[PDB]
Amino acid sequence: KVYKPEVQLRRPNWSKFVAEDLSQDCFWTKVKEDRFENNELFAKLTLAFSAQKELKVLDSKTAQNLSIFLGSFRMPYQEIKNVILEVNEAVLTESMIQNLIKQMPEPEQLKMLSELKEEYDDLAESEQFGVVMGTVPRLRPRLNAILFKLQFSEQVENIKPEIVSVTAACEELRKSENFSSLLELTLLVGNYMNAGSRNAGAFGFNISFLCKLRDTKSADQKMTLLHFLAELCENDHPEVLKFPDELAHVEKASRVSAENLQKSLDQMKKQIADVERDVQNFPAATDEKDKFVEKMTSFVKDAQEQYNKLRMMHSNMETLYKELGDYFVFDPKKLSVEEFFMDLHNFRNMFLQAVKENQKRRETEEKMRRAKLAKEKAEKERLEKQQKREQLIDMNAEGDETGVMDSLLEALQSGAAFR
């Protein structure tokens, strides 16, 4: 057959057969095509699956990327130049500035465009804009330093938090006596098991080993050294179970990156040094719209202020950690901060779970003892009821007995048969 649909539908891109040679005496030959045709069918079907001037300087690629950008941006080329000189943040945005830096012609192209500032109305719209920028002295330094200022507040807050977390963790750990307790307990229990071993009488173990306690199982691998320590705490030292709460920042610290932090700070100090060097080479402003050197010196101050706060906090953070290492006896230099707080975070989580698993074990154990009790009480209750029934008639001894039935009946009459 042949169809003709008004609306072009999405199709199954199969590989077709054609009657000619493709068919023979198969299934497909004996197929009545109208056997299923409705006009409603193709109705419902088409419903669901329907498929509804001239350039005097710039190369051809730049004039086209600007022709785009510019048509979209839409702002007096003069207004733009103004917001750049004033550094008017009332109009500036981070995105806005980055587009400018990416779209901007090269410095040479702008050089050759501000020597053509004679024939202004004669140029393509993509070079009218380029002329206007050819004015602003030290354009790219201007833009970069502006961008940095736009980004500064935000890039501080991707640093402070982490240094806070990690500092907190380091303090929390050193101050948690419930954690100290668990450690002492562990040394005790460990030193007993290691009796007569090479590991006998230890003054301490490495704190990293905590996540391995669990690996120490009983005979029937039904119990671990961690569940044991946790049950001990639960039964005889409830106070220790509270240590997971005395480490609120350990989880956040485990997620930090001491490297990215070290870099992040180091980059901020370079970016200030770069701005600082653009302010110290800057032509004295021709006109009063050029509030640059003014605003950036104000800024390069505040920036170095905040930066130095940060570098403190961070040099302090590194000291805490290095002292953690003195205190619990480990090589700070062998284990990144996060690796360390991850091991600790993992341990804490294991411990919380051990406690839980213990509680469920103890429940399952009650259940099984109580069943034993009731099932045994049952074998007694009945054995005793059976014994009372055999006190009526012993169905096995004296044969030449009569009155057996008269006995049963008197017991029944009197109540005696029932107990």
Add this chain to the structure above:
Amino acid sequence: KVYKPEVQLRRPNWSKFVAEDLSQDCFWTKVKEDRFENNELFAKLTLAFSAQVKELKVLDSKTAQNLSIFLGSFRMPYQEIKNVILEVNEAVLTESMIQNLIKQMPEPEQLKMLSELKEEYDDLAESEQFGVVMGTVPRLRPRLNAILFKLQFSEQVENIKPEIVSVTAACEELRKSENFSSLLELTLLVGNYMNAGSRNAGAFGFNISFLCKLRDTKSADQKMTLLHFLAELCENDHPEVLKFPDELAHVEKASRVSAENLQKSLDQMKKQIADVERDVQNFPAATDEKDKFVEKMTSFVKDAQEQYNKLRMMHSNMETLYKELGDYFVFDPKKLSVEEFFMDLHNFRNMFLQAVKENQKRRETEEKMRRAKLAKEKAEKERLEKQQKREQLIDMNAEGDETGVMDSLLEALQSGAAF
């Protein structure tokens, strides 16, 4: 400190700290070792974690020790063992026992070498006595070989048969399912309208492998697929089609076989009977009457080359059905394995049943939303009518010259009218 427990306990193989260079002014230096000690702690803990002859003349050193252990667990007379093997006494033989003998038997050279020392028999060690006895049974290795193949024959017949049955049945279930055929015709139709005006338009059939892909053709908003659509069509206008999954009961079993492994597995039962046939034709004439080999392995080689033929039948047949299916649905039987073909179909079947199910939930959800919309309008209209009735008492806005506004209200309350 120092302990001395009675029972070794499982321990933590931590790395220990010693007071020496290891401690300084750390956490461990300020620990009170006895702070947690009990004799009960160490009691619970000790509970949970406690830790509980004759000279060779032929045989190599290894073989001698193996036979020494085997003949020790086996424990049967070396003369008895000889008998069972000759008579083929099936009341004693086991797959297990005959696979031990083959495993432990000295090389034939080591038996020839011991068969030449049958003189010093009482002087030989156990391992070699056995060797001399077996060094006697003619063509021993072929004899144990043939004897096993017989013990196992039954079982290997029935790892071949049920698979040959499944594929055969599935092949029949398909060829004969008119409800499945229907679904194909309905698919071709829809497909054709959809492909109207493409290179695929007016197709006389599609390749049946393609079914698993129908679902890959989504609607405008990818909320609907060609497969759910086909499945709705059936639900609404052709229920029978929805029974094809039940008409294909063996398809899943067929999807799980291995053409390759049946071919190999049958061909090997061919060579195994041709290896035991010739092991009865080259066989030396029996010297004594306990040697029922040439006798029983001639009654086997007949019955075995008999069942192999019946399987070879079913198997040549089964292959024929699949080559015929290929002719009928138009696909190359040789480019696509049996199991591959039925796995594709089995998968499609599942896709179908599931599309059906998801359609229903969809329709339920469309109901719920509609009834909910009816009720939302019913209520919005309820309250507006009830509010229009409240305002027939008073319009707090019209004329203010009227006195008795409040006398009107009280006569309403008084009579019931206000209600």
Add this chain to the structure above:
Amino acid sequence: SSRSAMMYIQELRSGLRDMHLLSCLESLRVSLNNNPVSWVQTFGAEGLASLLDILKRLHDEYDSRNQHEIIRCLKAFMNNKFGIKTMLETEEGILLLVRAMDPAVPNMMIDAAKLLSALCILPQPEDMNERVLEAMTERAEMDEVERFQPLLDGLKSGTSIALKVGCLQLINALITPAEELDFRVHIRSELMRLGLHQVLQELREIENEDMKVQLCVFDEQGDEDFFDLKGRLDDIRMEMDDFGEVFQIILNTVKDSKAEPHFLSILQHLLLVRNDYEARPQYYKLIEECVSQIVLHKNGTDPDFKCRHLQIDIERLVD
């Protein structure tokens, strides 16, 4: 005439007392009952305020005649859309009307209860009934009684027909205008706890047209409510056909609530149903028919949670 309306305002503000205040209010009444609306606008809000300043002074302190008279003036004052509107704009106007409902002074309460009742009826503003209710509440909180106590006291035997009828009508005026079925049931049930049911049984014996009318209004509304709640169930049956879904919903409802333990005890007791093919469905059925009488309680009231012997009838009412 218009000169003496400005005067009233200054007489009320002069500190008249006893019978002098009285003869001034009696005249104020007739002036209001007799001069055209425009004269009342000329008495206006500032004069309303002085009635109300006095009303508050009297309540705070045989005052009866003075207070009651102020109530007759109020009725007169608010016998036109202007007065009513102005009334509503007062901060404590509706509250003082409420405080006038002293079953001690049956005739004052009767008059105040009609005004309040009329207020509940108004189309605008939205939900007058609730603002009346709010005032009833506030009074109730400062006297430390139940907000519906005064209403129930007036329904009690020795009190005049007129007061009875007036209390029931105000009750009907708080309930009937309410949009939400949940609200009506709330209030009805609150009255029932205070003893309403038993009081209605006594008023049913009295041949009195006005009383029959308020009773018929009250009953029909119970009925409509009951009927509406039967409908809630029909919906539920249509939408919650699934054990898991229903189970989870109940769970979220009762969790962290004094109802959780009970729901657990219900489920635990069901497990105790005798494991017999015939009896088990009958237990469940019977449980189900008793749960129905309890939850779909009749007449749009909660069940009496305080009765020590609750009676349940699972025989059919009509055939």
Add this chain to the structure above:
Amino acid sequence: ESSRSAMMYIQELRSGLRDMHLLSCLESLRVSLNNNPVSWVQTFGAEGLASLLDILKRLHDEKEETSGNYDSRNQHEIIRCLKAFMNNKFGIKTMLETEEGILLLVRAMDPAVPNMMIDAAKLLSALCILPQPEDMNERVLEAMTERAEMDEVERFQPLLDGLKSGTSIALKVGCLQLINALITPAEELDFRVHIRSELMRLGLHQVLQELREIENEDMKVQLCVFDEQGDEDFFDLKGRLDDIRMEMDDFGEVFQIILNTVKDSKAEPHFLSILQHLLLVRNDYEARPQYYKLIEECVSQIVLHKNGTDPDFKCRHLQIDI
């Protein structure tokens, strides 16, 4: 005294005696079995017993086909013989060995012949009481059940008829006694409840009201047994509840079990309705908890019915206590 006469009796029995002749023989036989040594009985033994029962079978069969029946005497005399024959360990054991003996005892329970029903019910009750074999009660009951299917009547009918106002105090006491003998020896609580609930559906509860008035020591004894046994069954059911509370404290796990229990049962829809109604519980912070408490009291008083019987599912009024 003679040991040959036991063999003669076996022969007369099989001779086809009728009326007063068969009766005069039974009466002699009753007396022989009651006076001779147990060894005499053994000689009569099984073949004799079987001869008694073949007759009893003929008599119960001619009384189904009749209108006015002097037969009572012979049937009843056969029952008197059985007692005598079972008045020793041998006879009892021999009886239980029969294929139709317990059934024939049951069929002698006709309230219109009270003194015969009395004697036959005593023997049945004695059988229930026995320590060996196990579960004699259930075998007696199986027979009562088979009689019931043949006559097409409730298997506990004849017992309730025997308790009705008209009948002698002696017959009432005998009917209660056999009820007690069917129920009390059973080890399984559910079984005691099943049976008792069954007797109640047939009207047992009202009859009990009447019997508690009767000033009769034998009657009080049987009532006290029945009552005390009911209280003990209630006490057990209450203990199952304490067990459930201890074990099943998780909403989900209990729900899944209730479900598994009612699924594919007439009880499923009722359960769904119950849950739905809980959704309808007024949504108020004070009233909701009280609704649930009231509902829980109602469920408790239904499921833990007192006196170890089921609730009366036909009674259409309940008084929930608080």
